[PDB]
Symmetry: C3
Subunit: 217 residues, 3 copies
Amino acid sequence: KPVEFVKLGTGVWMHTGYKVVPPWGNIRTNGLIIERGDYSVLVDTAWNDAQTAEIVAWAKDTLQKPIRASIHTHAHSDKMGGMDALHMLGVETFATDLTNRLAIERGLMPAKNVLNISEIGSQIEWEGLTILYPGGGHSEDNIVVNEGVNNILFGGCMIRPGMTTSLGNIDDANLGYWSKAVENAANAFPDSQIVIPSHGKPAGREILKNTAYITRP
Amino acid sequence: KPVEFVKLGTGVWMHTGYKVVPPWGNIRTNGLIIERGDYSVLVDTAWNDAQTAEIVAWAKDTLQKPIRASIHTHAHSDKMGGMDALHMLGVETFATDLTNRLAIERGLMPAKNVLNISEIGSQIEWEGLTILYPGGGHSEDNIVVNEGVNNILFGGCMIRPGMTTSLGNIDDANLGYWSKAVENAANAFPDSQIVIPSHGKPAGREILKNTAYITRP
Amino acid sequence: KPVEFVKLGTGVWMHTGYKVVPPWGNIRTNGLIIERGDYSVLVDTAWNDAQTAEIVAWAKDTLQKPIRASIHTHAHSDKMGGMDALHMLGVETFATDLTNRLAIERGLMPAKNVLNISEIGSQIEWEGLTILYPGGGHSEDNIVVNEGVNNILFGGCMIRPGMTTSLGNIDDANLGYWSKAVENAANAFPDSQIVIPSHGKPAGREILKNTAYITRP
Ligand SMILES: [Zn+2]
Ligand SMILES: [Zn+2]
Ligand SMILES: [Zn+2]
Ligand SMILES: [Zn+2]
Ligand SMILES: [Zn+2]
Ligand SMILES: [Zn+2]
């Protein structure tokens, strides 16, 4: 069950790695590779260093656009489990200040560069993407990332897969605000008809609606 | 008004970028590129990431001496506005501990490596240059950098342009010590007949004398 | 007395640099270069940046396996005196949290990445090596590194040379625990018949036994 790559749009790729989570078998986690002119940028590691090193190699060897920098969408091991590989492979890593503090607390390696988007609704442009902090949801520090050329919204773990009603790992969730965070992301990026959850298949905006329903108070 | 490069001496180049500062039009900021055997070092970013990326590209493509490391002469956006570009482009950045703390406070990105020159008069050798902390002046953390082969003193923003009497952005100035800081730099580097201010043209030691006069208590 | 390289095993090299320590003449310090498939990893700097830059160049030019990352075995200038060179040359550096804190206190540059092995007996795998914190000895933060293919134990400064009875620089030593730390390292890596001290020649396990004897309460 090695790392998979699939095209989502012009210059936009999904990476997927798998980890057995007992007693439930293999759980996928998804991130993105986004091409620029002669390099690429990364959204999230995979589960560990070996999977993450495969992603770096694939961008270099298949796209011929080496990964120069990355952004991490919250402090859990599906999104930051491969930080050491990124650092050793010359990738310049970015996360929010809160994400880095939580990463250190949780035994994960922090990113090298801090983004300051602590207020709900804060948005910044990063490497041609829009990063939004929509408020706490799956994790207090969760961020979303929008690719406005193809109109692809990376919801990460804040967006649940398909029509599930399961909530996933809620150890760090903000159960009170999660549905509002989803609405905030949906309202910020109305043109994005492709939505990417971490733990399921690419879908459309129906997975924003389903997630907001199943997590609503 | 794109980034300009001009030769100051053997292996020493000035980079200049421009920013409109309302209501006064385009304001230049200057830094240096200094060649070593097969790489170069940088003094200051330009105003932003795009200008700073042009500087990195020009060293690689025109000098064939890629920028390996940089030093930043205080925590303002003319000197550190391009830090993210440097970090993404593999440049190893240096600043004093005070500069990094002020950068974080001011919303700028800190350098990756800390120099400890906190006492007035402290000097260190860095990549064949002499770095001096002459005391607070234009900004409490301002440093100067001397290139002793061509005898070029980079005064940065601590040295005002030409015969102006205007003081520039004094929000963070040490008005009591600035003239003494200028004298300290002048006495430390007597052989340097080329003096580079951030916001005006290269000149000689008369701009040390003029600055010390116009900022004197 | 320039930097020396000697083969210890398949893909494992010792680097040695020298520094005059008045009034006693030239003192060697040793570290390792360990090959991987198309890159190498480094154990310790040499005494300063120039020596450390020679090591980086030799891995690139002679092994054709550039140094990608390094580990530092405690916060003294024989092990971390070349950090600035590593950082400028693109090496991703690692040390324990305690080592980094001591480095900053002692005027050395900290590593870029923190390992958390603070409890006596903690072991981690790093780049195919086993890193062990055996407890305080030569320095409170000393770690050892084992290369299990050739069975080479890098004892660093925690292991004294040959049959000496001298203790070296004990400014930061844990004289009460040092012999137990040596025993802990010996028991953790029983198969390693090649043992490398920082300040003497490669030897066998007799230098573990001698060190434990001469430092025992
Ligand atoms: Zn999560
Ligand atoms: Zn997740
Ligand atoms: Zn300024
Ligand atoms: Zn200025
Ligand atoms: Zn030592
Ligand atoms: Zn030593």
